[PDB]
């Protein structure tokens, strides 16, 4: 097919709507001051959290073909070897 | 704040009230950049005679219902940049000769601007750009019969009513760029001149049917929007402009008087033949992008007026320009394609063709009318109106005798040509005209030019080449710059690169394998002159 | 300038008919509708209606950001020692729900909360088990993750968002879990093998909760399409079901040129209408549902399951 | 033909080329004086899909 | 799984995809599944309360 692209159009537009959904999520009518916020590295309690949320842990088109396929009776070696006690139930 | 013969130039922060001790003699006030928080009537209404009142970046949110109303004479105001979404009623009073009110950039909200807005019977240009907007209702303007030029890009405009600026009779100039529209059902907005469409997410345009009065727009732009077909102008007389670049257009006398048309970067895959028939007196076309796979302006009379018409990255694989079709084409841009076979009096048939760009499109031209070369070649020989032709990164396997015989162009450029083998004399009917040559890259070894004879050349770029020898000269030639860099020359004589020293201004070794002690003549040529 | 307000579906019906034919005969890999005349006239076996029948049967605002709080697990010497000392079974982890309450105040507001371990042994594979403590003396089942072997230290979450909600609401002063192996009935003897700190990195909830002082027709939405294959298609080659519902997106996601500072109620535009902050969003299904048939080839009768093709939510993008 | 697992042509008429799976992103910012930590979601894009 | 109470007939799946396609590659004569009631590390027994 025939194409409209500006890879830097995109770029930029993608910028501009990421400025706008982070200022929305956060619902902020303008981003806020930092006359009042004090100096130095952030408390060490803060940068502990944000470690803890930032690092990662361990915890097809085409249609198909139905079907079906019963289980052996209990007529023949279901009962004789495996007897359905209280305790399970064999298939 | 600074003072001067009636302007009191505050000055641009730490200011948190409007100052008291001033005198009202002056008439242009500023209070842009402070920190005003709220503006009361009192220390306000005390200037009287005002003609400019600049309360730009300020945090003002609330405002006296009467504050700006004793303001006899006030002839500008200026709100741009502030907090008046949090206010209370009333807000401006009803001005007495206002011609300019900029309420940029202070989030407003549909509806507030009702109970914010009063009566200006003078008004003249209102600009609400930069604000939070989302609808245009029957109410939203109304008693300003005056305005002229209307803001209102950076919105979020996602709709229009039907009599939205019907209370505005003498609009000319308006501006929805940036905004949210999706669609436009009609247009009865007869004065209008200037319309920006630009940067929405409109999907189809349409105008209205049976024209009881004469529409007048005449500028139109309608860029990076998502138009799917190429809308009617029968209902848009005097267009003289359109900009449909990065729409989806796919193409399946309204525009007798259109004169700069954009189509780049839609999905014209082929042109249809009366498309081009209507559209007379075009200066300016621009086709580029469009996946054109041929060109078949081939009627005679189509375009008589075109000046420029750009074709460039379209994939064409072949012209079809008549004879006298095009007899005021002038600049010409074909780059991007892959051209194999053409006729060859295709571009000698352009009465008045000056620029005729070609680069990547492997077009070998061929000997001339004696002498004749191969097959499908394109006869550069014959144009005696061209002044300027790039031929980069064509694939030129051979260069004729003849091919620039007859073409006094004042600029050529062949670089990026691996492989070239330029012929004796090939550029024979240039010595005179010629002004500018490129060969850099090409990778050729052996310099064999009349350079003695191109009196009129200028500059000279040879760089990325294995060039052995160059012919001695023989006189202070006018070539101003020459390039040598990545080359093969090690040692350079003196002699043999005569003169040199009146007009030469830059002369480049960097990137060579020079060797110290073997120039002599490098040593005195970089004292005065030129760098490296 | 009157934007356009009126939409017309008819047009967009014929198009999605089309197209829905198309997406059938693809899927099928049937470049033509198949044989019919050959079919054996009369009732299906019931045997394929039995097998359709089982088939077709059934069986079995986060758009925002959340703030994030974390509590350690109460140290050992506390609750943890005395009572329910840590033997071979299992593991105790305890919480101090006061400061729990501290971090969210209100137990509405929580989203999501997750328990973290570091798990310190590497070879051994092992099948551990999650419960909840339920009074001073019963637990409860909440779910069991299966470890794998490693050669470096890793961490661990579980889900354990109920369960807080439940202690914010009704729980007591000091609420914990139990991290027992899996014993079947046949395993006489099973042991925790499996070690983690503290027992520095002690195990700890991350609450993810809205915080307090954030607690508060022509968009894009699913329109009703009813298809029927004997009358707006007109095929007979297709024996069950006789037409379904294959509702259909409509309606266009205008984008929003952002800015650095804008009204409060027009943020709420960007969560309907640009929720991916896309270059060019586009009205998309959300939720597709696939579709059982019976049709015949030859003279075999086939039960085949056709997927998504049920729009049951349309998102921007 | 991974890319074509969702397309379902009879529902939207015309394919546009969406994310597949997204992640979250937390970030630290200053509300006044006291620090943050927030964690916005559907932020980064993993991989694509025809729908 | 956890057996809500029903007062009706239910039907319930399992998802053995995985085992199956190993049965079908490299499986045994006869393979087969048990379903079994949950057993506590507490030296405790259980019976299956649930009629198929």
């Not at chain 2, 760009?357 to 014959?382: H, M, Y």
């Not at chain 2, 091919?403 to 670089?415: I, Q």
């Not at chain 2, 691996?418 to 990778?443: D, F, K, R």
């Not at chain 3, 027009?266 to 048939?293: D, R």
Request: aromatic letters at 6%; one cysteine or more; charged letters at 20%.
């Amino acid at each position: 097919t025939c194409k409209t692209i500006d890879m830097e159009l995109v770029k930029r537009k993608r910028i501009e709507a990421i400025r706008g959904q982070i200022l929305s999520k956060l619902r902020l009518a303008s981003p806020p001051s930092q006359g009042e916020v004090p100096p130095g590295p952030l408390p060490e309690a803060v940068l502990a959290l944000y470690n803890s949320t930032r690092d990662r842990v361990a915890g097809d088109y085409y249609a198909k073909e139905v079907t079906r396929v019963l289980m052996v009776e209990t007529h023949n070696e279901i009962y004789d070897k495996f007897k359905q006690s209280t305790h399970s139930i064999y298939m | 704040c600074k003072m001067v013969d009636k302007k009191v130039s505050c000055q641009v922060l730490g200011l948190l009230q409007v100052p008291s001790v001033l005198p009202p003699d002056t008439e242009t006030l500023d209070l842009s950049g402070n920190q005003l928080r709220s503006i009361l009537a009192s220390p306000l209404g005390f200037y009287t005679a005002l003609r400019h009142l600049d309360l730009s970046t300020n945090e003002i949110s609330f405002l006296q219902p009467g504050a700006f109303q004793a303001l006899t004479h006030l002839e500008h105001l200026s709100l741009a940049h502030n907090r008046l979404a949090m206010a209370s009623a009333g807000g401006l009073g009803p001005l007495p000769r206002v011609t300019s009110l900029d309420l940029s950039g202070n989030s407003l909200y549909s509806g507030l601007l009702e109970r914010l807005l009063g009566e200006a019977p003078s008004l003249h240009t209102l600009s609400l750009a930069e604000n939070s907007l989302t609808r245009l209702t029957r109410h939203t303007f109304r008693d300003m019969p005056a305005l002229e030029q209307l803001d209102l890009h950076s919105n979020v405009l996602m709709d229009i009513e039907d009599g939205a600026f019907e209370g505005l009779p003498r609009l000319t100039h308006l501006n929805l760029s940036r905004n949210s529209l999706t669609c436009i059902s009609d247009f009865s907005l007869q004065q209008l001149r200037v319309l920006d469409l630009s940067c929405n997410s409109i999907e189809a345009f349409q105008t209205a049917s049976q024209p009881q009065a004469e529409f007048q727009l005449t500028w139109l732009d309608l860029r990076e929007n998502k138009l799917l077909h190429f809308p009617d102008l029968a209902a848009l007389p005097r267009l003289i402009y359109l900009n449909l670049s990065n729409n989806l257009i796919r193409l399946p006398r309204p525009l007798s008087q259109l004169l700069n048309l954009d189509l780049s970067y839609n999905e014209i895959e082929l042109i249809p033949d009366s498309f081009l028939e209507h559209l007379t007196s075009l200066c300016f076309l621009n086709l580029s992008r469009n996946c054109l796979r041929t060109f078949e302006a081939r009627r005679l009379g189509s375009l008589p007026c075109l000046m420029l018409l750009d074709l460039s990255h379209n994939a064409l694989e072949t012209l079809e320009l008549g004879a006298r079709a095009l007899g005021s084409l002038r600049t010409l841009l074909l780059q991007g394609n892959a051209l194999r076979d053409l006729p060859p009096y295709t571009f000698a048939n352009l009465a008045s063709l000056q620029r005729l760009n070609l680069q990547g499109n492997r077009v070998s031209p061929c000997g001339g009318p004696d002498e004749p070369g191969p097959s499908g070649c394109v006869a550069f020989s014959g144009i005696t109106s061209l002044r300027s032709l790039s031929l980069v990164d064509n694939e030129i396997e051979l260069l004729r005798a003849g091919a620039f015989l007859h073409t006094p162009l004042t600029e050529l450029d062949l670089s990026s040509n691996p492989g070239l083998e330029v012929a004796t004399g090939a550029l024979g009917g240039l010595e005179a005209s010629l002004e500018v040559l490129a060969l850099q890259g090409n990778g050729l070894m052996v310099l064999q030019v009349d350079l003695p004879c191109f009196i009129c050349l200028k500059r000279l770029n040879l760089a990325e080449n294995r060039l052995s020898h160059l012919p001695a000269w023989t006189q202070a030639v006018s070539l101003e710059v020459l390039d040598l860099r990545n080359n093969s020359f090690s040692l350079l004589p003196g002699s043999a690169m005569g003169g040199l020293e009146t007009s030469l201004r830059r002369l480049y070794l960097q990137g060579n394998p020079l060797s110290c002690c073997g120039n002599g003549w490098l040593a005195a040529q970089l004292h005065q002159g030129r760098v490296d | 300038l009157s934007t356009c307000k009126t939409i017309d579906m008819e047009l967009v019906k014929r198009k999605r008919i089309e197209a829905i034919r198309g997406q059938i005969l693809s899927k099928l890999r049937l470049a033509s509708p198949p044989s019919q005349g050959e079919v054996p006239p009369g009732p299906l076996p019931e045997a394929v209606l039995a097998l359709y029948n089982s088939t077709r049967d059934r069986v079995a605002a986060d758009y925002y950001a959340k703030e994030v709080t974390r509590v350690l697990m109460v140290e050992t010497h506390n609750e943890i020692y005395d009572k329910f000392k840590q033997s071979t079974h299992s593991i105790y982890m305890f919480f101090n729900t006061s400061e729990l309450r501290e971090a969210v105040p209100e137990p509405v507001l929580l989203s999501r909360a997750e328990l973290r371990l570091l798990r310190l042994k590497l070879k051994v594979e092992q099948h551990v088990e999650l419960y909840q403590k339920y009074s001073n003396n019963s637990w409860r089942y909440l779910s069991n993750r299966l470890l794998a072997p490693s050669d470096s230290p890793e961490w661990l979450s579980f889900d354990v968002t109920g369960v807080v909600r439940q202690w914010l609401s009704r729980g007591g002063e000091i609420e914990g879990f139990r991290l027992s192996a899996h014993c079947s009935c046949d395993s006489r003897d099973n042991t925790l093998q499996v070690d983690i700190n503290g027992f520095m990195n002690r195990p700890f909830l991350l609450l993810m909760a809205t915080p307090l002082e954030r607690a508060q027709e022509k968009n894009c939405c699913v329109r009703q399409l009813y298809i029927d294959f004997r009358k707006d298609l007109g095929w007979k080659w297709i024996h069950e079901p006789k037409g379904y519902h294959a509702n259909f997106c409509l309606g266009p996601c205008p984008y929003i040129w952002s800015l650095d500072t804008q009204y409060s109620k027009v943020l709420a535009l960007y969560n309907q209408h640009n929720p991916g902050a896309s270059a060019a969003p586009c009205c998309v299904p959300q939720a597709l549902e696939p579709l059982p048939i019976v049709y015949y080839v030859g003279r075999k009768p086939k039960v085949e399951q056709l997927s998504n093709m049920i729009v049951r939510s349309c998102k921007c993008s």
